[model samples]
Target: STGSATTTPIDSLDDAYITPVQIGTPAQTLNLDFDTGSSDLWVFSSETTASEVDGQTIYTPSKSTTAKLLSGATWSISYGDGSSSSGDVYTDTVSVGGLTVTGQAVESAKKVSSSFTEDSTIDGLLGLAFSTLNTVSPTQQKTFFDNAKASLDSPVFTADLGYHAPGTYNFGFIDTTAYTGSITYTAVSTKQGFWEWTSTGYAVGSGTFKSTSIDGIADTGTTLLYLPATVVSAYWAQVSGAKSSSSVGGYVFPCSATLPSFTFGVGSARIVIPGDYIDFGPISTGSSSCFGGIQSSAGIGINIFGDVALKAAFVVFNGATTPTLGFASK
Candidate 1:
């Protein structure tokens, strides 16, 4: 079977993209971030403390006839940034677009970070990464994608993230018309439970491509692109008046600076990110400087190819026994 659903950006910044999901018998609709970086299908729910509940939608299992308490099962997910959420588990029918999975683990949050509480746009997250990363205590749970893959005609999903407009996530088959040029398949390492792959090299606009073996993950959840300090430095060096300010925690440059495009390789494919996309908007409404789209992943051991890089191409997460990633120009 094949199914597709629209993914909406929370705001103009495109900080995060959310997909509508139907859970339970009565079908509680919730906007969830389909994160490829993490593996835990968690959500805001009736179990959330009232004080912590902001303006987001909450899932109430009590209302669903098909909802079943996964007795004694609990889950917790902590990120590298130190933020985390923990909760108990429930099993129910979950639907994403036209795809449906029975007995899907719907983790109901008991607690969440202030950052999550303040962001009212997304109610929760749906994990698409490998299931090995699931954090459930007694028994690990399968990701929504993992549970649905068997029924899908092809064990793959395609992400078509947009800049400001809406995009779609398609399961089962590739939309040949969705991208331009032929796709380049690259080996993926699920060993880390991420869409981790090695990029061949990178180049500044019109510059020569350097044969640097950069290892990074294609993280749809991340807001920006982070690379080795060397690559980030080279890209920013080409921009006039750019400075890496510790106070702001990233490089900022003149808002009107004539920025050059950035490019990276997956196999032999050269994916180019236009200059305008790199100017990730002005820092402040009254400020003349803008935070760059690319930053240094100095302390973080792995580089992240996030939305900034993702929006420039079409990405496919192929879930065959021998998993692979496909990148195509759009």
Candidate 2:
């Protein structure tokens, strides 16, 4: 049977989507971000400092008979946004939607960065990237999907993210009804442990689609879209009041600025992000300045097609063969 779960945007369309997951034998439920950018299933746990946890839920392995410690194992991870968590390891029965995996490695956090502790909305992160990226020491760990793939009818999963709407993530099966038009498949380079692919070209607004190739990773954990420095500058140039702000650290424009849609090539298909979506939200509540949803990947090293771009398309992460990425309009 295919496992499916609904993911909801945390704050409208600002951040990553979170899905409900069950861990341990008694089935303690937690809201987790199913990130495609990295692999390491970690959560706030009993080991976490009470003062640091705030309003977040902690996973107490001792409460579950099925939870067992992976002796001498430890894990630590840092994200692009500087958020991080680290702790000892535990093996437990983890369930996503209706699919359950036995002996799944669940890293129980003993310490977390302020960024993670402050964001009480997320209990943990359920990574969906390749198992090779798992951060466990002594020996690497496998993700829930990697461990459950053998039992699935098809070793494939689809990410159907919606803009300000609840979307479903399907494992081992593809629900054609989740998207429209045809799914365009592209080969993925899994050597990097990410769903990395190159777009043939891109177009800003009604301008011509440049033949500039852009290699990037489709990362659900990230919030905004990131492109090369030149590409970002070109797009903002079209906006009358757009300017690179040193204070905000990215391009910002007047809230009333008329923006144009951005389109990128995927295989032979073109996926377009609406003009309104490109504006993101105001830089601050009641502020006249607004942040650009698409920004430069200068310090990030690699371009990232984050939620802003992914939500506009239906993505199929096929692990059956060469690990292809299929995209189509949602």
Candidate 3:
């Protein structure tokens, strides 16, 4: 079966994308961040310390008749800020949009670090990365997409994240009307459990395109566009007073600076991230310095084509035997 669901940003900044997923027999719906960088479907739940349950909804597995404890299974995952969560596992009937996966692994958070508790807008995360990346011990479970793949009409899912607006996630088939021109397909290596691929090169504004190979992941879990230092410095140099600021983190510029658009290549396809999208918003309220949405990935050691790039195009996570990634302008 196929399904399509609308995903929206948690805030005006589009910091993260949230979509609703139904879990258990009677369906305990949770607003989850659909993370493409990780592979665990953990949620704020009854097991989570009550103090850790701020404005987030808790998935009470005990209320569901179909929930079954996956004894001895547990998972723990960490984030950029060292924030983390760990928990027990259960198999439940999970549904997203209208598609159903009868025995989906649903992780229940026993404890959570500050970030997850503070981000009240999102109840948890549904990771779409390969099953091999799951953090479970003893027996790693498959991702929701993996378990649902057999029933998907085309065994693929497409992400259409928007810029400060609502977007859609389509399972089983691509919505031809969502994108412009034909999609450019590129080989995706799941070896690292990510939708990793090589980008041909990039250009700042309308400048000449650079014909070089840049390897990175199409990560929806990350909010910004991260590239090598060389590329980032090249783009930031175009801004009058832009500089890498550790205080605010990453590159920051004068809010009124005339920012330049960025374009990256895939095969012959050119994906452009508008200048305005780079002005990530003020470093602090009413501040003149603004944080940039594009930053250097030197510290992370891997380029990341995150939401900053994904919002500009339609992406197909072609889950074939030898999977491929497809990108098309929108």
List all candidate RMSDs to the true structure: 1.0, 1.1, 0.8
lDDT by residue (tens digit), candidate 2, 79-158: 98988889999999999889999999999999999988888889999998898899999999999889999888799888
TM-score (C-alpha) between model 1 and the true structure: 0.98
lDDT (C-alpha) at residue 256 in model 3: 88
lDDT of each: 0.92, 0.90, 0.93
Would you list the rank order by lDDT, best first?
3, 1, 2
Task: Tell me which of candidates 2 and 3 scores higher on lDDT.
Answer: 3
Question: What's the lDDT for candidate 2?
Answer: 0.90
Runs in model 3 with CA error above 4 Å?
A: none
Candidate 1 on 56-154: residue-level lDDT in tens?
999999999999999999998887656688999999999988889999999999999888888899999998889999998799999988999999999
TM-score of each: 0.98, 0.98, 0.99
Candidate 1, lDDT over the whole model: 0.92
Would you give me the overall lDDT of model 3?
0.93
Residue 227 in candidate 3, Cα distance off native in Å: 0.4
The residue-level lDDT of candidate 2 at 306 comes to 92
